[PDB]
């Protein structure tokens, strides 16, 4: 659940922020908690000061949010960040970390997607699967 | 005393509030332009914009065209301006065909009916402005020589 | 040249009207949903 | 979207998941390797196709493979 | 003679080339005083030009209608010194270089750090190897026949077909 | 005190051990090679000191000693030029007859027929003609014999030894601490007042006491062997006062501010010396003296141990306004902590100064008999133009390196750097638009003129006999500068240069300098120059401002200054680094400087340089074809490229045949560069796989595994061979043409 | 209530800055010079005399060698510098 009333870091603004596609197609939000007011680099260019307590920030791309998350993780030891997707209708979709546990750590209930049960050298030839809806993995 | 602020008090939008972008002079000029002025039908916005652009379109064609040193220089320049106006009207028409869905709303520029009204106004205004420029240059020797008739 | 009017009739049509109509209709075709 | 596959030569070193800028990969439980974990790609609609995961993979020829496919707004990395 | 060419010692265009070169150097010689170092240098150049044209005219070289020596390289023994014997000299030197380089590579494979042997040469061992190259055809052929030059196909890495 | 000398003694032992360990400076490289890429990496990061260690003190010590090493190499080079002038030159014969002896200070050995390159250069001498202008420099300095050149060569060699010893001493024996290097105010005071100020003062001393009397005797027609030695001008005040009578008054007019007494050897004449075609040496002596006074005054501005002086941090922090937030705050810390920021500023400034040198040195020839030495003029203009362009692009490159590596957003909150980063999109978009506008309304004029002349419509062209584009502002500036003597510079006898207007200064029936008129073609080519410079600025500035992040790659600073890409994703992220922007900006700099030097060569050959004959008419080298031909691309192709390349392609069998060989070889290297530029690494790696199979079949595969060059190295090798080929082609073409016809 | 930005009300002080900068630039440039560009007058007075001379020759523009262009350029350059510095000093310090 994204609290829209979380205060934002003090930023003077830039031309690198989100465009019309954020208000028309989709927008991303990142929240995190800091122990102090401190200066971080914006992923869109420029320096902003995050406040002590909670911080909510809006970006155009998921990669910008995760770059900011990596920056605050490796420079300020902040790991509680949450990344959401917001649609023009007002629907908020929680994205990261998806089950509360970071993806580099194994969590129960996760099911494997895209796993192939053989080595990469065992894929089928394109001539084998031509004019046929078989996948090249077999 | 800071002259540059975040746009619309939003520090994360991709814009800045600057004296060129958000001053009182800029806001008055932008809000008083026919493309943005309130109380105008899209047809009348088209009429004003077309009158201005079609009026100034005659000049470069008349003074710099291949027939500029002939006695029919103004007639050729007006005809070239009219051809450019027709091409731009076709551009406006195909833009409106591919850009807008057919909606009941017709009082806004960015609607299908509103864009068709704007295109009609722009065509009529452009033809009228080009014809007015043709009349004035045809009948006033100051405009034929761009001021050299005074010397 | 016999039928000397035909270049002056057809060259402006083929070089300006044909590409304009083709570009307009191709634009409409490739941009429509 | 791009297609990301993980083959059973994966040793569960979690390097591809740490290298992913778009949170496409994650570690799930497995018994095929000594680490007891395998990479998986449940979120390939967010995959930009940067192949940082393939750069991170230490197994001779890669266990994680990215096949570039249909381009979307997310996969093209468009902020507009 | 061969291919319709004439010997250079009786071709008039060869003589015309020689005369033109000598005249071109002599008109430069005319602007300098006798005994000055430019005059001696120009006269030495004239002497070298004359000696070169004389030697080329007395060597059995064939000249075409351009007036320049044309080499015959079809294998005939009357022109074996124009390509075949320089070719044998090159092949001897090149096989020497290849043999001593291969020998040094195989020695460096036996070292503690082979790559250090590649970038920092063991100069006495390399000089031993470059001394060994004078009998490279027999050594290379004995290396070949003993199975020490060619390695079998199942021991070389290949891409998936 | 606050500014003091702090030194560590014997920090690095002098030893040959690390000489035997290539890659010792880098922990990644010190493990030794496993692939050939290592070898390239060893030569690629070696003088990149900040990537080997994080200590600013060690980096600064390495930089100081490497600068000493460069000074040693420059002094050895200068000593070589003096020695080769002393022993292998026709300099005395040139001193006797400057208008008829071609300068030559290189003689080749006879080996394979290359003795043909020892051309007949006059003065009873055979050699390679030299165009560096050293003969004119030595004549201006008063060097009349080759013995003095031998002594100059010895002085250069001794200074080279002193510099290399100083480098070893100040790295290996007594290395200054970081606090010593971080004195910007003291360094600026000493380098403004002592390096530039005392240098200008001592050179003014040499000019007044040595150069002026020797050159006055030379211009009066005295033979160089009968001129008195310089020390005789020093001690015999009567001999000095015979030429300049104010020397009879001594130093009393200087100390009593009766300076006008010195008006006979400190002049403000302007124009050129009619005998030599160079600047008046009295004007240069007042110039260097006035510069000495101004520089010594400027060197007392900055605060040091005593309380007087400006503090640069205070000066920077006081200048801030309503448009700019915190203003110039934080820049002093950047410029006293980051070596790359200083290198960026100084490379940009040195490049701009070199370009200014090229313009001001062709237009106001400062050396005797250098104006009518057309090969020297063309060579030095082209050379300093190229050095300037390279240094400016290097300033952009090292700015990008600072932005990636040394920039800290915490210390840069709402200052000018932060606000520039925060409106980079507006900057780059407006620059992009102005570049497209300049390209259209400058190059499309040439395209329009090509089409109009090809269509048989001459009255529809942009020309002086057609629709005119008059350069009215530059013509007005030329009129002002022609009217200036007696009106806005009332104490100047002549104009600053005759290129603005005036008489035809001719020396030995050759034009030293004449008015350079500006017409439609000059309008078009100056706006072409503006277009190319704005596009180069666009590439370099976009690379600098987007070096850390962008909308495409939000974490670009983590990838570094120099990376090939971020993969085929996001549509493709190829050449996204700031380094690749420098790589493209070097191409555009090449294009800009090539057009600039072509404009110079054609305009000087067509409208300025030539022979003066009876009735005062000037017959120019190409006969004034610039006005009607430089308005089309066809005219540039035919009347400049095709016409003036006749000398380099017919040079075979002459002394200029080396230029023909270099011409062909440079075309070859340029074409060879396109293999690296147009191709990619994966093809070459797979071909190398097949070649590795061939070497493996004969058991001769190397232990160091061969790899294709890296993507960045492929770009760098292609760019290096491209620049070498193009610049060498222009080099050979210019030199052969101007030696033959000028 | 002139807003210089979206929410920044700022007093431009156009009457004071214009009048003070005009007087503070014109009065020092009344210093005469005997050079032919000035003709015995100051920079401002030679500029005004040149304005009168060229306005007495309407249609016909001043020629390239006419002193009007140089006088106009120097006078307006100094005037713009004075106006910029006066705007800075009066709007910022205001005391
Ligand atoms: C008046 C004192 C003085 C002078 C002349 C210089 C001169 C120079 N400094 Mg410098 N410097 C000074 C004080 C001075 N510095 C102080 C006080 C500091 C500490 C804040 C520094 C810190 C400093 C650094 C960190 C660096 C320099 C560098 C340089 C060189 C710049 C490159 C150049 O143009 O060389 C060409 C100019 C020449 C004059 C060449 C001759 C070189 C010798 C040493 C001149 C010695 C003249 C001598 C004092 C008087 C003898 C002349 C005559 C009477 C016989 C130049 C030699 C750079 C360099 O290249 O270092 C090697 C560099 O990186 N300086
Ligand atoms: C094969 C194609 C083709 C043809 C037939 C022409 C024909 C012509 N061009 Mg040309 N042109 C072309 C391609 C072509 N162009 C291309 C590709 C370029 C880009 C390099 C140019 C760039 C160009 C320039 C820059 C100029 C011309 C001009 C001219 C005119 C010659 C001078 C004259 O007497 O005009 C007298 C002109 C008139 C009497 C006015 C005619 C107005 C026409 C009849 C109106 C037509 C309206 C429109 C096409 C309606 C259809 C719209 C629909 C397609 C959507 C002539 C009409 C010159 C000119 O005068 O332009 C007007 C001129 O300045 N051309
Ligand atoms: C294009 C194919 C081709 C090839 C491969 C050769 C090859 C050869 N030619 Mg040749 N030749 C050719 C075309 C060719 N020729 C043509 C078209 C002509 C006519 C112009 C000639 C005219 C020609 C003449 C006139 C002679 C040769 C000879 C030779 C041989 C001398 C080399 C040697 O030392 O071997 C011989 C030595 C060994 C095999 C062992 C020595 C250890 C060699 C086998 C010479 C020869 O002896 O032929 C048999 C000779 O006299 N050739
Ligand atoms: C030890 C030396 C050595 C030897 C024996 C070979 C042997 C071979 N090479 Mg190879 N090669 C070498 C070095 C060597 N290579 C190096 C250093 C390079 C990098 C420039 C290459 C690049 C190369 C390519 C690109 C190709 C070959 C090919 C070949 C094959 C045909 C012969 C040929 O084309 O030669 C020509 C060789 C060259 C042009 C490069 C040689 C460079 C120098 C001159 C040789 C090294 C001498 C070395 C310094 C000696 C040090 C010894 C000392 C310490 C005692 C053959 C298997 C070709 C092939 O696959 O054919 C089937 C082929 O296409 N090689
Ligand atoms: C670093 C620069 C430098 C150096 C080392 C010298 C060195 C010298 N100058 Mg010189 N000079 C210089 C710059 C320099 N000058 C400049 C820039 C000017 C222009 C203002 C002069 C103007 C000048 C004059 C006008 C005279 C000297 C004189 C001298 C000699 C001093 C004799 C003396 O004390 O008489 C002192 C005499 C008094 C009457 C007191 C000496 C060779 C004197 C000399 O001997 O002439 C050769 C002399 O008359 N110089
Ligand atoms: C004052 C001059 C100066 C100084 C001190 C530096 C210093 C530095 N630069 Mg910089 N740079 C400069 C000028 C300068 N640069 C200019 C003018 C340019 C524009 C071309 C650049 C472009 C530039 C780039 C693009 C990069 C650097 C980098 C670097 C760093 C490492 C350089 C290195 O290890 O190379 C080691 C030395 C070599 C590899 C030798 C290069 C040999 C060249 C390519 C060929 C020379 C050809 C020769 C002149 C003619 C041959 C012809 C003949 C064969 C016929 C170092 C901090 C690099 C870095 O990582 O910085 C952090 C980097 O990426 N600089
Ligand atoms: C001759 C070859 C050539 C040409 C024409 C261009 C053209 C251009 N380059 Mg480019 N470039 C080139 C080689 C070339 N490049 C090479 C070899 C490199 C390798 C390093 C680069 C690297 C490079 C970079 C890195 C950048 C450019 C940029 C630009 C643009 C500059 C803006 C401009 O001038 O707009 C005016 C357009 C032109 C002058 C193009 C020719 C158009 C003429 C006037 C005729 C137009 C007639 C009309 C269209 C006819 C219509 C007919 C109809 C049938 C279609 C422009 C599109 C810059 C850019 O895009 O930003 C502005 C930029 O940043 N280029
Ligand atoms: C060109 C004329 C001129 C100049 C030089 C100055 C200069 C100054 N004014 Mg000022 N002022 C002017 C016109 C000018 N004013 C006018 C017309 C008005 C009325 C609107 C005012 C009203 C005003 C107020 C109300 C105050 C000032 C203050 C100041 C001082 C600090 C603020 C500042 O702008 O520093 C500018 C700094 C410099 C000029 C020095 C740096 C030098 C560099 C090279 C820049 C100079 C540019 C160039 C050389 C100027 C050429 C002038 C041109 C006409 C030829 C400074 C001495 C303040 C103060 O403290 O003084 C009492 C203050 O309270 N001024
Ligand atoms: C340049 C025009 C100019 O006069 O700018 C001058 C103006 C100076 O602004 P300030 O008075 O805030 O500057 C104070 C400091 O920046 C100077 O010490 O700069 C701007 O307005 C920002 C740049 C606008 C750039 C637009 C292009
Ligand atoms: C100069 C100025 C100073 C510097 C700054 C600046 C602002 C940028 C600049 C402005 C430059 C620009 C911006 C100047 C502003 C320019 C524009 C181009 C002026 C357009 C005027 C259009 C009118 C005259 C046509 C009017 C219609 C007439 C009455 C028609 C009657 C017709 C109607 C349909 C009915 C039928 C009869 C006919 C005759 C057919
Ligand atoms: S290609 Fe890039 S975004 Fe896609 S899964 Fe791999 S690392 Fe993640
Ligand atoms: S990097 Fe490779 S081996 Fe490691 S977890 Fe990912 S797919 Fe498996
Ligand atoms: S083509 Fe080369 S540079 Fe471009 S994305 Fe692929 S690997 Fe990177």
Numbering used by the authors:
A (entry chain D): 4 to 141
B (entry chain L): 2 to 152
C (entry chain I): 1 to 33
D (entry chain C): 2 to 81
E (entry chain F): 28 to 188
F (entry chain A): 11 to 189, 192 to 754
G (entry chain O): 29 to 123
What do the authors of the reporting publication say about this deposited model?
The structures of PSI-14 ACPIs and PSI-11 ACPIs are solved at resolutions of 2.08 and 2.14 Å, respectively. On the other hand, PSI-ACPI purified from cells grown in the S-phase does not contain PsaQ (Zhang et al., 2024a), whereas our PSI-ACPI structure contains PsaQ, suggesting that our cells are in the L-phase. In the PSI-14 ACPIs supercomplex, 14 ACPIs are named ACP-a to ACP-n, and another subunit ACPI-s is also found, whereas the PSI-11 ACPIs supercomplex lacks three ACPIs, namely, ACPI-e/f/g. The 14 ACPI subunits form two layers surrounding the PSI core, with the inner layer composing of 11 ACPI subunits (ACP a-k) and the out layer composing of only 3 subunits (ACP l-n). In addition to the protein subunits, we found 255 Chls a, 20 Chls c, 58 Alx, 29 α-carotene (α-Car), 12 crocoxanthin (Cro), 6 detergent molecules, as well as 44 phosphatidylglycerol (PG), 17 MGDG, 3 digalactosyldiacylglycerol (DGDG), 1 sulfoquinovosyldiacylglycerol (SQDG), and 422 water molecules in the R. sp. In total, 422 water molecules are found in the PSI-ACPI structure, the majority of which are found mainly in the PSI core part and form two layers, a stromal side layer and a lumenal side layer, whereas very few water molecules are located at the antennae part.
Among them, PSII splits water and generates electrons, protons and molecular oxygen, whereas PSI transfers the electrons generated by PSII to nicotinamide adenine dinucleotide phosphate, producing reducing power to be utilized for the subsequent CO2 fixation. Different from the red algal antennae, cryptophyte LHCs contain a unique carotenoid alloxanthin (Alx), as well as Chl a/c2, which are therefore termed ACP (alloxanthin and Chl a/c binding protein) (Zhao et al., 2023; Mao et al., 2024) or CAC (Chl a/c binding protein) (Kuthanová Trsková et al., 2019; Zhang et al., 2024a) instead of LHC.
